Amino acid sequence: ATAAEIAALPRQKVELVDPPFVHAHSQVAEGGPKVVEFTMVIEEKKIVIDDAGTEVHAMAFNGTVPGPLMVVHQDDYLELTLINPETNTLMHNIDFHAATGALGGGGLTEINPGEKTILRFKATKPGVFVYHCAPPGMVPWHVVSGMNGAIMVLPREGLHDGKGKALTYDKIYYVGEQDFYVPRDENGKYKKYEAPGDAYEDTVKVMRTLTPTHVVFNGAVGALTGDKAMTAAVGEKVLIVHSQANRDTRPHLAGGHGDYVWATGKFNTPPDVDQETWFIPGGAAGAAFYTFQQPGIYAYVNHNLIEAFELGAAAHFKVTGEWNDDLMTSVLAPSG
Amino acid sequence: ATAAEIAALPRQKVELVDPPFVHAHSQVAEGGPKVVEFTMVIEEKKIVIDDAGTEVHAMAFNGTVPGPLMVVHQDDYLELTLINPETNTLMHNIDFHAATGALGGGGLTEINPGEKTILRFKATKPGVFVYHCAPPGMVPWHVVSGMNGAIMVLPREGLHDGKGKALTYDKIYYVGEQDFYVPRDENGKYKKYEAPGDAYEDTVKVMRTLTPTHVVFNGAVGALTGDKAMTAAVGEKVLIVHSQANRDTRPHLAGGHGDYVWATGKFNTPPDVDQETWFIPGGAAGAAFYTFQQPGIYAYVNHNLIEAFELGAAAHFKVTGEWNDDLMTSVLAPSG
Amino acid sequence: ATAAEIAALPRQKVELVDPPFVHAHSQVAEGGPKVVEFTMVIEEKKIVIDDAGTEVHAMAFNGTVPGPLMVVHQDDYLELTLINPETNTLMHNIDFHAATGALGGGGLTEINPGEKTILRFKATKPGVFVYHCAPPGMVPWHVVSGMNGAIMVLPREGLHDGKGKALTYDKIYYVGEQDFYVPRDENGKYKKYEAPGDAYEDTVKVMRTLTPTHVVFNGAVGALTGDKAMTAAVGEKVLIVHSQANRDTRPHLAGGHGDYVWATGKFNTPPDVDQETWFIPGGAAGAAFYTFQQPGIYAYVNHNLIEAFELGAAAHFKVTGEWNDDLMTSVLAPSG
Ligand SMILES: O=N[O-]
Ligand SMILES: O=N[O-]
Ligand SMILES: O=N[O-]
Ligand SMILES: [Cu+2]
Ligand SMILES: [Cu+2]
Ligand SMILES: [Cu+2]
Ligand SMILES: [Cu+2]
């Protein structure tokens, strides 16, 4: 397309919503290619990640960890207005793995505090993709400070299985998984700092051990449990997008399965099926489609169970509906 | 199916055998759906995992690590009578990744010492699947104490490759891989504990390093070597089922290949072919089919070679038969 | 085929070239099966792997880390003359994951300093495969000292996509990734040893932490950056072969994608497409095909960004050509 042709395309302003929820969108594209506009303000802020009051100096796109999910369709253009407030202390940028050229846009979006930039790229490949900040010289530091999220580029005709049959979800959730490296003092107590830069040296030392002190969903232990558990009902089709910008993960829905799982996150790669636990490598996003058949609580976890239950990588789904005794039944309940 | 229809189905009681062997079964299903009955007694027992005499207080389904492989066909029902003897000290349960509902059955099988329970579930999806204990609040501790195994749900028509060609194995082995986290004293020597609970706190500290002290097959360093090496013959077709309930692994058969590998362990997901080294994420089972072509010793290992040779993840196959010089030949033997 | 037939096949000697470059070859086979001959001399030598003068006693096939890429076609025979000079101190051998029998040839090629051997094997399976030294009892030490490389067994008809369409590259690079475990003294300074054997104990202790001190491409931090960045032009089709003999990796081309990626490295397994970040398990090689669409610098990294930017696993591609504003454009450059 020429610059003139692009200029004539309709524009649509999207309002982003906080993970794990996803902004309003349509699975099958409504109309021809459009320039979908998004705006995100970067917020450097303290976040408490566990019940011991442990703090991380988050570098958050749109104020959240992970950053919000942006949804467009293949061959639409995604136009992001990225803002770095003067209240922030560091330069930041954005690299969209879905984009082609200039380090995913990273080389064209370096903005110092007090600056903004507008990047436009053509979403030529369908799938879920990670996006993350990557300032030359301080790349992993920003990413493990939570400056990452993902986008979904739906096929114009919506999702399909490996045989071309349509797959239409009733609900969609975005689970961003984050590995944190929090410095400790000589007594094993996590350290606190009053400036992001003050923690750099100490954090790099923990990062080099390749051993996170915490692995969490939606920015903190318990963020997607209790009252913030994701919900669904028996019979509902749910798409669960999961990303990890720096480290491998292996999602599992206990009591359920990944009926269709685009493990590589790319829709032109046929989905694996009947999955018990899938694998998403660091630096990628993946997506699993499941139709709930049983009511009750489901644990959604990174299946290295130490990471899930000792380090924080566990979420819950609360499902309503009727119990199916054909699928499962307690013939004899626990008894002497 | 209705309760009455299920009650009318034939029942078949199966006697389990210890890994790496698999109880007798038919690859192609005989007759229509059946309620296949299994019984397992949980044993908290001390086991030795290396030649130095290192001890682990194992939590073992059927007394072994891994727990035994249960084999059924798609749409059969698996009915497990699980027993927790009064000689044990902890509550245990079972989560079948092959099952649908109540955390794989975990929420319906919590039994204290002195109790038993019978769980029945419909094996709706074909493939190999992990099963493991998961008591709320002490999940990884039970799993990395060895309380896990796998089941195989065969398609009713047996196995086939990705294009519909039948694949019939001559023998099958189940290799359970276990990551252990054994506390050490100030001399770097592994510690021993009078009772299992005594080791909890020290063990959790090692678990948090995400660095196992031992990674073994069939419960101990060298368990599948020597008189206990697996065996085959040139021309023989072998299916190797491999599981890891908590941590990633990358199986490799040195001198051979994975002719067909259901890396995700799910039979409706076409198998990868001609594999050198495959990958099974923690929380899953995988299966590889190979037709041996050369006699001699083979090393079957987790291909992070430090985990294989320093930590214990190495097994052997002894293969009888005639050497094939077309496939490989020493043109000049080691010489000056 | 018959005994006479094999003996009558043409024998062709090929001159190797050091990574990341690849020796002369044709994508589509030229003529019928041939016995392709290679010779490699093993060199034990001290190499510097970072900007601080850190040394490693490398064990290098053909004097390089990784060893060179050997290219043959399916059903050709690869006949390697492996030489271990009297100036070396250790016994070495070679295990080709592409080969069938005797631990990949390892059991037939054990050569002490002052000896040579010639191994021939039929390359029956198409794909990229790891080869590595594996002396019984000291396997990981040799592999993590850099004694590994890869070969590519191209289909006789060249590469094809999942639908059977030809994929012809304009150039190919081989990126060998190496995890090193260098001992440090109590002050955190890397240690130096007079002979390879002197470092054995200290090195195995670091290996057991499963935490590399360095993760590098082509043998050193920054070996594939700056004046040694790989190159391409917009419109050029590039195949990037990547191997890791001991540990997992997750390659990503920043600003680009893996248009077709044989993640398992095996050509009869259909390639995944539109990949952002692919996964290659330790003990395997993978291959990615990409057609460059934008000029500029690209970062090619292991996407655990700590491993890439703190440990050394980052390379660059320098691409010439015309910028495509349809694909990406700065609508508003960074500004107040
Ligand atoms: O779902 N926990 O294995
Ligand atoms: O099987 N050792 O590469
Ligand atoms: O390519 N760095 O995310
Ligand atoms: Cu940033
Ligand atoms: Cu990236
Ligand atoms: Cu238990
Ligand atoms: Cu589980």
Ligand SMILES: [Cu+2]
């Ligand atoms: Cu060697």
Ligand SMILES: [Cu+2]
């Ligand atoms: Cu190997």
